[PDB]
Design an enzyme around this catalytic site. Sequence first.
Site, short mmCIF file in Angstrom:
data_model
loop_
_atom_site.label_atom_id
_atom_site.label_comp_id
_atom_site.label_asym_id
_atom_site.label_seq_id
_atom_site.Cartn_x
_atom_site.Cartn_y
_atom_site.Cartn_z
N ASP A 39 42.39 -80.11 -104.98
CA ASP A 39 43.53 -79.96 -103.51
C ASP A 39 42.62 -80.82 -102.46
O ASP A 39 42.13 -81.86 -102.58
CB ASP A 39 43.55 -78.60 -103.31
CG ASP A 39 44.70 -78.03 -102.80
OD1 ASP A 39 45.68 -77.27 -103.14
OD2 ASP A 39 44.74 -78.43 -101.21
N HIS A 69 44.44 -76.34 -96.54
CA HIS A 69 45.01 -75.98 -97.54
C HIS A 69 44.24 -75.76 -98.88
O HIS A 69 44.47 -74.55 -99.52
CB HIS A 69 45.98 -77.07 -98.15
CG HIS A 69 47.06 -76.75 -99.19
ND1 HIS A 69 46.82 -77.17 -100.44
CD2 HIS A 69 48.41 -76.30 -99.02
CE1 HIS A 69 47.62 -76.80 -101.09
NE2 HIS A 69 48.84 -76.16 -100.32
N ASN A 161 58.42 -76.53 -104.27
CA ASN A 161 58.92 -75.56 -102.97
C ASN A 161 60.21 -76.27 -102.58
O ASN A 161 60.68 -76.42 -101.44
CB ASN A 161 57.99 -75.61 -101.51
CG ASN A 161 56.81 -75.10 -101.94
OD1 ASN A 161 56.76 -74.35 -102.85
ND2 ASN A 161 55.75 -75.76 -101.43
N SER A 224 52.19 -73.01 -103.49
CA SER A 224 50.98 -73.40 -103.40
C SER A 224 49.98 -72.14 -103.42
O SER A 224 48.83 -72.12 -104.08
CB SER A 224 50.40 -74.24 -102.37
OG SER A 224 50.73 -75.53 -102.45
#
Length: 279
Positions: A39, A69, A161, A224
């Site tokens: 990530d 994130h 998404n 996520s």
Amino acid sequence: AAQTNAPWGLARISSTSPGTSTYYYDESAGQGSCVYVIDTGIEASHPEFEGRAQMVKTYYYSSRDGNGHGTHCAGTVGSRTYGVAKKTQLFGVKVLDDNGSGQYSTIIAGMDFVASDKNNRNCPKGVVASLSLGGGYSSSVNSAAARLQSSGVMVAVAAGNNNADARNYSPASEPSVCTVGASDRYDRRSSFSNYGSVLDIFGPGTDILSTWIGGSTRSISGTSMATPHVAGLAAYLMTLGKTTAASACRYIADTANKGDLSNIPFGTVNLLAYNNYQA
Ligand SMILES: [Ca+2]
């Protein structure tokens, strides 16, 4: 063990019903397992990680998470308050820049890095990788995720998404990994969650409280956020001896809460990750 007033998603993955607020789990808590968070990095110095997190690779000028994130995802895997597997070891691989994006060539390199690097780490209960990232379909990205899984790592990937079929996104569309959709606290499919025959499982993904950079916390939403619930669950179950890296996605699907989600398109699984912890 029981953690009162836990984030709703932790409570949900140890419950047969929505609407509760205590997280129940075996105290082993993923000890002896490892989870790679591929990530934007992990703010390891965050007390919530208790020294159990470490950056092991970056493809950028720094290994610092300048976004948040990756720190949030790592927190859902394994932070003390916000994590599923509160004793796992967390390894950060920074394939995403501080704006949250990365080139596919860098993401591929990071996956192959984990497949090798696990041989440098002590993970007697097994190894998991959490990939809360993705873009459009790429056979090269899918084959990297397939290699990582084949090497003996439980790979959990975000479905995406786009409120669309995950068949068009990578690494979501790689069949051999564990592709994770998102749900909300009322057991709806999250409005943005991808769907389709390639999904393996859903996890909590709307309004998820976890760690953030600057020693902070916040709630955010996405597939996520669902992915690290499943990655942490896998680590937890592998520490308990219930499953292995090769078999954990199927085991999670076998033991999931079945048929309880709303707005699940025909042909998409109605399976919600569940730890079946029964004191
Ligand atoms: Ca799969």
